[PDB]
Amino acid sequence: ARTKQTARKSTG
Amino acid sequence: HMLELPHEKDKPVAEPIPICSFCLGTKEQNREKKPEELISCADCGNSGHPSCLKFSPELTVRVKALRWQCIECKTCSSCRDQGKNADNMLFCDSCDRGFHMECCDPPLTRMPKGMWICQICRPRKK
Ligand SMILES: [Zn+2]
Ligand SMILES: [Zn+2]
Ligand SMILES: [Zn+2]
Ligand SMILES: [Zn+2]
Secondary structure, three states: OEEHHHHHHHHO | OOOOOOOOOOOOOOOOOOOEOOOOOOOOOOOOOOOOOOEEOOOOOOEEOHHHHOOOHHHHHHHHOOOOOOOOOOOEOOOOOOOOOHHHEEEOOOOOOEEEHHHOOOOOOOOOOOOOOOOOOOOOOO
């Protein structure tokens, strides 16, 4: 699953 | 077709910014210097190449049909707030909407191991 936190890390 | 929530319909749509917030490329130049249409945030206008957003083509087609919020703007589709913990807002793997774990029905305390999809994207039972 993804969260805002994981999406930030993934795309940042 | 992707179903829209009543509050998403007729909400203002921000002026889209025609460059990617991740790589600064236009629709003509993603990171591989290839053309790629942008996805744009309806709240702040910030855009991203789907490749820079790490979206699959399937998810991309879906989010393009919806009033989408960027990572920073995303608010819970249930309570309409952001809250203070980013690791508490799940993003749906079908529509990319955000939901706080405590706003799910029933509430979640622990992260799902695989995909997570929201109640909007789950089909009705027979
Ligand atoms: Zn980009
Ligand atoms: Zn935004
Ligand atoms: Zn919520
Ligand atoms: Zn969904």
